[PDB]
Amino acid sequence: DMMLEIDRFYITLQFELAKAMSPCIIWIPNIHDLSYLALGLLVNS
Amino acid sequence: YQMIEQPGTIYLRYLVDIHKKYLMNYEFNTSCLAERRIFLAHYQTITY
Amino acid sequence: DPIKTAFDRMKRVKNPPIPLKNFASIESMREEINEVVAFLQNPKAFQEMGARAPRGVLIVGERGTGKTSLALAIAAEARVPVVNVEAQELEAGLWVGQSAANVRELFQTARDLAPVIIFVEDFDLFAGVRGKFVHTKQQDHESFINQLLVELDGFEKQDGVVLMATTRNHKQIDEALRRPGRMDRVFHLQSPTEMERERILHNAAEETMDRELVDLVDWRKVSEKTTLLRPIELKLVPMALESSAFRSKFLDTDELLSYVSWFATFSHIVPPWLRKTKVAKTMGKMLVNHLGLNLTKDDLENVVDLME
Amino acid sequence: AEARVDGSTGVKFADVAGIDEAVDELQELVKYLKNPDLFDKMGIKPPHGVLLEGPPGCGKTLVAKAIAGEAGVPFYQMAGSEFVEVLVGVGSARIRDLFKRAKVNKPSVIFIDEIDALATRRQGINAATQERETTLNQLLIELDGFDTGKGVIFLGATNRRDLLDPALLRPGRFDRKIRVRPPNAKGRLDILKIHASKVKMSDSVDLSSYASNLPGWSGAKLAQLVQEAALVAVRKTHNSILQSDMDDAVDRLTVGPTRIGLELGHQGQCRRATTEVGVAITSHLLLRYENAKIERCDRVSIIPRGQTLSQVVFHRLDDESYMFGRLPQLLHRLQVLLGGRAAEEVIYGSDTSKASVDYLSDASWLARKILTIWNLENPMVIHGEPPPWRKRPQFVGPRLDFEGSLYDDYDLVEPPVNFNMDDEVAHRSEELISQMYNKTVSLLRQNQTALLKTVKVLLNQKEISGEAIDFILDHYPPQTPLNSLLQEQNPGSLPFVP
Description:
The structure is cut from a larger assembly and holds two copies of chain A, one copy of chain C (308 residues) and one copy of chain D (498 residues).
Chain A: H1 2-20, H2 36-44
Chain C: H1 2-7, E1 10-11, H2 30-41, H3 43-49, E2 56-61, H4 67-78, E3 82-85, H5 87-90, H6 98-111, E4 117-120, H7 139-152, E5 162-167, E6 185-189, H8 194-208, H9 219-225, H10 231-246, H11 254-265, H12 272-275, H13 278-291, H14 297-304
Parallel strand pairs in C: 2-5, 2-6, 3-4, 4-5
Antiparallel strand pairs in C: 1-3
Chain D: H1 20-34, H2 36-41, E1 49-53, H3 60-71, E2 75-79, H4 90-104, E3 108-113, H5 128-144, E4 152-158, E5 176-179, H6 185-196, H7 207-212, H8 219-235, H9 243-254, H10 266-289, E6 296-301, E7 311-315, H11 327-347, H12 357-373, H13 420-445, H14 449-461, E8 463-465, H15 466-475, H16 482-486
Parallel strand pairs in D: 1-4, 1-5, 2-3, 3-4
Antiparallel strand pairs in D: 6-7, 6-8
Helix pairs in contact in D: 1-3, 4-5, 6-8, 8-9, 10-11, 10-14, 10-15, 11-12, 11-13, 12-13
Subunit structure (chain C): Oligomer.
Function (chain C): Required for plastid development during embryogenesis. Might be involved in chaperone functions or play a structural role in the thylakoid FtsH complex.
Binding site for ATP (chain C): 61-68
């Protein structure tokens, strides 16, 4: 239950930072790699 | 690199340039007759 | 705790995007829709009369028919709060049996506020037929579906909660979940008919674009051109018609960017009475005439018989 | 581990029906649990464990609960999948604790459901495999260490005996292996009576007909049938389950529920009607003229149901006629299979369709099984061939289970060496198929008014019965002219009221 917390905190900090320095252009290479936490993050975003 | 040769990077440059001027934030007007037609023609001339 | 973060997302629906009176292909089962709505607005009324209230309603159809909008219209007619629970939080893929406690908490917090709606989209992805998954995706799914079955079989406890679930095909759901008592009503939404399409398209013509261009369009041809579409596409048809009609003339890009940017910038300062003044109404007309952007009937006629 | 120690399980042998052979066999264990000293004085060693093998829904757990209730002994029920965890060694500890608890309360009955989850064979075709092996070894050690005079009876239920470890099948661990067969017609009748005793029933429902007309149905399936009929009666606001509710539930389980106005054009529907009516008419004519030992067409429908656009319900004959399939019976069944394409040829001329090729497949295989596998003709063959296409025996589609199955070779195939005998066999098969096709076309062409009248009646009503087809055949003798049918006011009308 610790890896999930680390990943969730990391991705929420990524999205909060991307909000903070708006406007911003986000590049996401190799989306074929994606696991459930990031899918939920992107669906919610 | 004449104008006709590549439409994809041209559309990408249009997207970036419209992104540059905060022009998504004024997404649409719903105005009486003129601003709507101008934005409609602009929306068409982006994609084709 | 996914349950509490999902239950933080209540939405007291009052104005649906597509109302039930405007929704198409629903008249063949609208009696069951009204019965479900009557149960939701007063679960005690269904309690006192003793008949089995509809505990579950499944809506099936194609991607885009407005199944979520149909659920929103039903809830707005019912005036009951809804919760949008996604498929991701249900399948907590870290411990075996966490979905059991998840669905138990969801049902417990639903009973504490019932009558409510538990709305799930893409119900086919996680609650499909058993046995199709082979590698380590059986025990957790079996426990989840067993907890669902034991929660839908509440022994005459009509709290007032119903499960608005969305699937794409009727076969993919498990047969044990297809039985009545657990799954009471089934709404099959496939495609609108010609005259319903005509009415929805004319409403879209009235609510989206310039009204003065509505009469010049032969909407019968347009309705015969959009037969395989869905009500949201019937709403977005006039946008594409105006775009493709403005496509016909020979015009440049940069002037349209210039005017778009100018009207974007200087719409923040101008007064509203000056915006709607008749002088402003006659300003737009010769602005259009000077730009040569006069949209005509024949342009859109050639457009509509040009599309597929 | 909450192994439920129930003083009375609530299930006795009166609640078990149609499993009478296994009940008679397990009465010995019930007696041993009653007076173990009687077995002790005779020097009789009771079995260490008993394997209940069979299809799911046959009530093996119900049978074990009945044994425990009749014996009046503690009953420790647990599933095998509950012994499979992530931490290695927990399942062996649970096995030891369960056996210790059973040994404390003697006499007792231990029951392990789905033992194939633990005793999966090491097939040669994570640490979970090691954990399963350790738990299975612990179970073997516990079973081997049992003294017979301690009065503890072990039962293991399984649905797949092929997946079981042969070590457990050795004597001393599973001494008795009892096969729980599906209930017979009398057994299904008794099960239906038991399940209908719990729900308000109408006197018009005849349970014997549904017991006879649903072969292979388990007791759980009959309970689901009764529950679905009760649900239909609730939906139809009936005070009791009528015979119509029974028929609706039967049709829902067999061919599925009816759709809502999902119909294709008239062109693609008349073809299916022609195929099904031609098959039914050919079967009825073969019954009428040559007294064939074939099945009977009960009803024909063209309304889509489940995933089938059309259906012909066929009444299944008794199994005693399903073993000695003679050459005339197989030839008549080949004629029945070819009757669909015969109807397409005599009705729609030389422009046939795809809807009659499927039957044309089965006949094209069946004659091969006449010539190679069964070797019924008498130029003897040297080798058989396997079916290139395999189709499962099923519902309203044609029987193809006259010898148990159609697409199942009984391991009688050999690879060929000489290739001339192969073309000789192909020539003989083509000759037989062409001869039977010509015969069924000649038979169907002699009765055109009855076939066309049945097609029109089925196209109008969307359903027809076998007795209606028989009445059409009686009212239309052979060699009547077509103007008699074409001069009627309404061809799709039947004056018979069942």
